[PDB]
Design an enzyme around this catalytic site. Structure first.
Site, PDB file in Angstrom:
ATOM      1  N   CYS A   1       9.408  72.143  46.737  1.00  0.00           N
ATOM      2  CA  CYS A   1       9.742  70.729  46.941  1.00  0.00           C
ATOM      3  C   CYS A   1      11.212  70.323  46.805  1.00  0.00           C
ATOM      4  O   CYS A   1      11.555  69.191  47.143  1.00  0.00           O
ATOM      5  CB  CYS A   1       8.921  69.864  45.977  1.00  0.00           C
ATOM      6  SG  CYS A   1       7.135  69.822  46.309  1.00  0.00           S
ATOM      7  N   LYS A   2      12.078  71.203  46.304  1.00  0.00           N
ATOM      8  CA  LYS A   2      13.493  70.833  46.107  1.00  0.00           C
ATOM      9  C   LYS A   2      14.202  70.635  47.443  1.00  0.00           C
ATOM     10  O   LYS A   2      13.983  71.393  48.390  1.00  0.00           O
ATOM     11  CB  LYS A   2      14.257  71.888  45.291  1.00  0.00           C
ATOM     12  CG  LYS A   2      13.934  71.938  43.808  1.00  0.00           C
ATOM     13  CD  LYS A   2      14.779  72.975  43.074  1.00  0.00           C
ATOM     14  CE  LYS A   2      16.264  72.616  43.053  1.00  0.00           C
ATOM     15  NZ  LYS A   2      17.048  73.753  42.492  1.00  0.00           N
TER      16      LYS A   2
ATOM     17  N   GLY B   1      27.344  71.870  39.868  1.00  0.00           N
ATOM     18  CA  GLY B   1      27.372  73.186  40.482  1.00  0.00           C
ATOM     19  C   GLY B   1      26.645  74.255  39.703  1.00  0.00           C
ATOM     20  O   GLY B   1      26.157  75.223  40.292  1.00  0.00           O
TER      21      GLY B   1
ATOM     22  N   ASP C   1      24.117  74.868  35.760  1.00  0.00           N
ATOM     23  CA  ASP C   1      22.821  74.563  35.148  1.00  0.00           C
ATOM     24  C   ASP C   1      22.941  73.398  34.210  1.00  0.00           C
ATOM     25  O   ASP C   1      21.980  72.690  33.929  1.00  0.00           O
ATOM     26  CB  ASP C   1      22.307  75.786  34.375  1.00  0.00           C
ATOM     27  CG  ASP C   1      22.091  76.982  35.280  1.00  0.00           C
ATOM     28  OD1 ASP C   1      21.131  76.954  36.068  1.00  0.00           O
ATOM     29  OD2 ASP C   1      22.901  77.929  35.239  1.00  0.00           O
TER      30      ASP C   1
ATOM     31  N   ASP D   1      15.893  67.601  35.125  1.00  0.00           N
ATOM     32  CA  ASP D   1      15.029  68.246  36.102  1.00  0.00           C
ATOM     33  C   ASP D   1      13.722  67.485  36.181  1.00  0.00           C
ATOM     34  O   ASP D   1      13.332  66.799  35.236  1.00  0.00           O
ATOM     35  CB  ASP D   1      14.730  69.701  35.706  1.00  0.00           C
ATOM     36  CG  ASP D   1      15.744  70.680  36.279  1.00  0.00           C
ATOM     37  OD1 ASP D   1      16.099  70.529  37.461  1.00  0.00           O
ATOM     38  OD2 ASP D   1      16.191  71.588  35.544  1.00  0.00           O
TER      39      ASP D   1
ATOM     40  N   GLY E   1      12.672  58.922  24.235  1.00  0.00           N
ATOM     41  CA  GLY E   1      12.708  57.898  25.274  1.00  0.00           C
ATOM     42  C   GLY E   1      12.399  58.520  26.627  1.00  0.00           C
ATOM     43  O   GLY E   1      12.247  59.729  26.732  1.00  0.00           O
TER      44      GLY E   1
ATOM     45  N   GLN F   1      10.964  57.376  31.042  1.00  0.00           N
ATOM     46  CA  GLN F   1      10.631  56.412  32.077  1.00  0.00           C
ATOM     47  C   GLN F   1       9.322  56.854  32.689  1.00  0.00           C
ATOM     48  O   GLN F   1       9.173  58.020  33.005  1.00  0.00           O
ATOM     49  CB  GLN F   1      11.713  56.408  33.147  1.00  0.00           C
ATOM     50  CG  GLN F   1      11.407  55.501  34.323  1.00  0.00           C
ATOM     51  CD  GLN F   1      11.346  54.038  33.923  1.00  0.00           C
ATOM     52  OE1 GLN F   1      11.510  53.705  32.755  1.00  0.00           O
ATOM     53  NE2 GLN F   1      11.116  53.157  34.893  1.00  0.00           N
ATOM     54  N   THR F   2       8.377  55.928  32.842  1.00  0.00           N
ATOM     55  CA  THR F   2       7.042  56.234  33.379  1.00  0.00           C
ATOM     56  C   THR F   2       6.636  55.214  34.465  1.00  0.00           C
ATOM     57  O   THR F   2       6.393  54.037  34.175  1.00  0.00           O
ATOM     58  CB  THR F   2       5.968  56.215  32.262  1.00  0.00           C
ATOM     59  OG1 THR F   2       6.398  57.024  31.156  1.00  0.00           O
ATOM     60  CG2 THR F   2       4.628  56.703  32.770  1.00  0.00           C
TER      61      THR F   2
ATOM     62  N   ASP G   1      19.457  80.473  35.228  1.00  0.00           N
ATOM     63  CA  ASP G   1      18.004  80.670  35.157  1.00  0.00           C
ATOM     64  C   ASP G   1      17.449  80.644  36.569  1.00  0.00           C
ATOM     65  O   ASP G   1      18.076  80.107  37.491  1.00  0.00           O
ATOM     66  CB  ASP G   1      17.302  79.640  34.256  1.00  0.00           C
ATOM     67  CG  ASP G   1      17.580  78.220  34.672  1.00  0.00           C
ATOM     68  OD1 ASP G   1      18.750  77.912  34.982  1.00  0.00           O
ATOM     69  OD2 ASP G   1      16.630  77.407  34.678  1.00  0.00           O
TER      70      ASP G   1
END
Ligand SMILES: Nc1ncnc2c1ncn2[C@@H]1O[C@H](COP(=O)(O)CP(=O)(O)O)[C@@H](O)[C@H]1O
Ligand SMILES: Nc1ncnc2c1ncn2[C@@H]1O[C@H](COP(=O)(O)CP(=O)(O)O)[C@@H](O)[C@H]1O
Ligand SMILES: [K+]
Ligand SMILES: [K+]
Ligand SMILES: [Mg+2]
Ligand SMILES: [Mg+2]
Ligand SMILES: [Mg+2]
Ligand SMILES: [Mg+2]
Ligand SMILES: [Mg+2]
Ligand SMILES: [Mg+2]
Lengths: 355, 339
Positions: free
Chosen positions: A26-27, A48, A50, A68, A142, A144-145, A246
């Site tokens: 999906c990226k 550029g 990680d 991410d 904290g 966000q949903t 990674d």
């Protein structure tokens, strides 16, 4: 060990129902990404790699952080939560940073899921995220949903480090070797698990692998994806790692190339073999150009660290990580005098990896 | 749109689904979902406040994301950024040390549209950040059924830099720094009121949503603010009640008047319970700060923010003895804020 039944849901429930799987993931692709983002004494790191590294105005400290998000990839909610969290943290660990001062959680609830499911399924995911954060020695304070057609699972990991707590990913020299700490083929494993609930699809690779093998690569993928790179990050200090990234969404090769371009020295990487969850190469190979697990271009999720180690520290590192309790690592290639590019040789050796 | 080899019918807001009640998971659910999870602020306000080991410093950060709400990609990126920083500003933190950006590229939009539109959104985001003296040094960009627009703001703070939002006392007054009605302007402009009434309202709201809360944050220090939040996805009453519950003292919030974008109150009334604007639970996007201010200071704050780039703010209510709740009065006066 997740049964939709055991929770008062329909036997038919798949957490993987609330997104659409793609062999190639999906990226937004690397090259498309790099173009869209064109306008955007103490070592700094901007877009550029990680993690950013942002020197602070206070006492020689630098802000190290990463974000991410992914979508559901396994049907086990609790484990999926662990994975979403481990994937976030993966990137601190690529910088050798073992501590996380704080996490935030990015959550999407599927607008397609009933209230009953949400109140039943979301808590498992949140518990999973919290538990991984707890192993990581940190907590979620904290986030966000919001409602989204799909279940969105991500977050932010931030550390305020002293200079030695992080290792700049650019010190490779010709003669270093490449150490990969988790096996490849996660995308094949999760997708192929989803295909068994779908006749047409299961008919195709039915002839390649048993339902037992598939269940086995699934539990294994799920296990390693939930596995923190925290230990690997710590060992990078001890065994004098020169650079690491990674292996997540752009695949072993995309991220290898991405590390390669960051090197201060005129070096290149050659990958000679690939550790791969058993039976997954044959599966990828069986589905033509769908995954491309063989070419280094198939998405990983929450894969392992790819590390540039001194030739002589490479084996000590592997020894240590595998036998502390631990998980084996593999030396997959070499760094050479070169032009800052990465390649896998034409016919790489497949190290078939069994549970 | 036609200006960028795009459909006369290309609409940025096509790539989400409009709900008069917005897209956030309700305040009440979120608490059930989340109940498994030097001053210290955890879950339940605008930023977290994590004391660190170094120099008496604290890590103050926030994350948010929204979908298209205006049909100008550049302004939508601007609004997307102003929105993430707003939370640093609620805390009175004028400086941002770093931002990350969250992007979702809709799978429903063509490569051609993606290639024209996203650089615009990103460009607005970049400009907004710069206006705030910061920049974007990372993020995540992923395909989604919708265009997704967020990021993260981070500051590593000396104790002097933030104002703990829990220090209100009886007699303080509540000032609001941006007018209300954004969900209504935004909802109807995609569609009692004229198209000129709706166009000009949408134009106001769009500029208001892109405005930073930064000068208000700074002024919170100048005028000794006692607490603050910002008015966003849960609307005016929602955020006021979440701020009230945060109070150290036994105080409650009473809101007497509502400064609303011209005519949007009129639109809300007609759409039955589609918005519920005068009831307090109409979602805002990148709304103003709601500040608890000593009565003496509040007037000057308001005069000062009006002209130091100048913008109007309203004294909308009072701080009183109570049990840490908030309410809108039964017949609230609607202040009509014209363009
Ligand atoms: N998935 C999550 N994990 C942890 N904390 C969360 C999550 N979602 C929301 N929160 C926190 O719960 C509170 C309410 O969320 P919001 O209403 O989005 C805060 P705001 O309106 O200031 O953006 C805040 O403390 C927010 O940081
Ligand atoms: N919308 C965005 N704005 C700014 N930077 C971004 C954005 N999306 C991705 N990036 C940055 O671009 C680089 C490549 O993206 P990713 O491959 O997702 C980083 P990783 O693979 O380590 O998760 C990273 O440094 C990331 O922080
Ligand atoms: K990252
Ligand atoms: K927030
Ligand atoms: Mg990474
Ligand atoms: Mg990423
Ligand atoms: Mg990553
Ligand atoms: Mg807020
Ligand atoms: Mg929020
Ligand atoms: Mg917010």
């Amino acid at each position: 060990s997740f049964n939709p039944e055991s929770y008062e849901l329909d036997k038919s429930f798949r957490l993987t129902r609330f997104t659409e799987l793609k062999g190639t993931g999906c990226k937004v692709p690397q090259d498309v990404l790099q173009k869209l983002l064109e306008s955007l004494v103490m070592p700094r790191l901007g877009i550029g790699m990680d993690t950013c590294v942002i020197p602070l105005r206070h006492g020689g400290l630098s802000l190290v952080q990463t974000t991410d998000y992914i979508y559901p990839i396994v049907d086990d909610p609790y484990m999926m939560g662990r994975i979403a969290c481990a994937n976030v943290l993966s990137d601190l660990y690529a910088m050798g940073v073992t501590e996380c001062d704080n996490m935030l959680m990015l959550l999407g609830v599927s607008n397609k899921m009933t209230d009953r499911e949400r109140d039943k399924v979301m808590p498992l995911i949140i518990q999973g995220f919290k538990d991984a954060a707890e192993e990581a020695g940190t907590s979620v304070t904290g986030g966000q949903t919001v409602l989204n057609p799909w279940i969105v699972l991500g977050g932010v990991a931030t550390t305020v480090c002293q200079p030695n707590e992080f290792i700049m990913p650019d010190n490779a020299v010709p003669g270093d070797v490449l150490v990969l700490t988790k096996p490849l083929g996660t995308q094949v494993a999760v997708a192929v698990h989803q295909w068994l609930d779908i006749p047409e699809k299961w008919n195709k690779i039915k002839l390649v692998v048993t339902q037992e093998d598939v269940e086995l690569a699934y539990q294994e993928a799920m296990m390693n994806m939930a596995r923190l790179n925290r230990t690997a990050a710590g060992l990078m200090h001890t065994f004098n790692a020169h650079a690491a990234t990674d292996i997540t969404g752009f695949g072993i090769l995309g991220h290898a190339q991405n590390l390669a371009k960051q090197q201060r020295n005129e070096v290149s990487f050659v990958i000679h073999n690939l550790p791969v969850l058993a039976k997954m190469a044959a599966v990828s190979k069986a589905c033509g150009n769908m995954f491309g697990l063989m070419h280094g271009t198939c998405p990983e999720t929450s894969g392992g660290l790819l590390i540039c180690l001194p030739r002589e520290q490479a084996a000590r590192f592997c020894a240590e990580i595998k036998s502390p309790e631990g998980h084996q690592a593999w030396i997959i290639g070499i760094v050479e005098k070169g032009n800052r590019t990465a390649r896998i040789i034409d016919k790489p050796r497949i190290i078939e990896v069994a549970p």
